[PDB]
Amino acid sequence: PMFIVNTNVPRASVPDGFLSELTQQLAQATGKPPQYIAVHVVPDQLMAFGGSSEPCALCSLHSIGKIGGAQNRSYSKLLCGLLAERLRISPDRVYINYYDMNAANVGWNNSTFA
Amino acid sequence: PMFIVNTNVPRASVPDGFLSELTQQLAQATGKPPQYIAVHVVPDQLMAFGGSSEPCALCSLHSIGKIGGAQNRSYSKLLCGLLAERLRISPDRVYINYYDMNAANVGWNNSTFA
């Protein structure tokens, strides 16, 4: 799985161990070994949400399977809670794009997962 | 809707109110309330277009519906004009990826839009 977070929150506001917490939490959430989870956090972004530049986040989760109505809702609960708790970002100011990737469309280690 | 712009144009070249202009213009364009529009601008990027590092942009627009042949062309007219006017980026050096997101695949406020 691959999780990317973009936020206008400053770098100094991201607590230590955030990436590790994201990795653990996502491995738990997806049922995938943490050795496969990729996390990426991009702070200090020039962004706005609903016209306001109040703290906000635009993220995405790419996974080969594990994507669906019920699962995505759990993911949002989780991810929004972490951003609200760890980054002080209001959940109503967070967008998360879900992507169910086909194994043949994910490249890794000189090949694909197909 | 979610609009992201990546450009090699320096930060100093992005005029004040650009994010607000993008928000307004996109709300008009999509017929969605501006309180739902998320805009993100990433300047000073290390990029090239057709081998040249002349001013250029790589963007994407994610929307739940409002995506199709005719609409996408309007969007491009608009977005390219703004980048050409506001950022001095030649429209033939701008790429915009359109994404018709399924409501169940967009997370927000501890859940999805499903």
Added chain:
Amino acid sequence: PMFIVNTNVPRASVPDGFLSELTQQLAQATGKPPQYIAVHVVPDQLMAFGGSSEPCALCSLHSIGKIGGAQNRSYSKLLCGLLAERLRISPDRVYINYYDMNAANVGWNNSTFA
């Protein structure tokens, strides 16, 4: 085609001409004129792969066609080798998302490719 690379590798570690090499190599690979190839490299990223912050990369290749099982594997061979050679990133720590874009969903020069 559009290729984006995100890595934790410092800027100073990206060799000169890397973007041009990526452009050339991708044009060869896809059979598309290099005047259409867009490349974007984002170094010094705050990321982790499998819990480790050892050098790694999260990339994506968007193309209108030229995407499939066999082609994607070639792309991965190529891209991973360049990252391993040029950036010293282990291929088993690189993810590449492949996207077969529909022409009507790609905006360029005030319109779409439809």
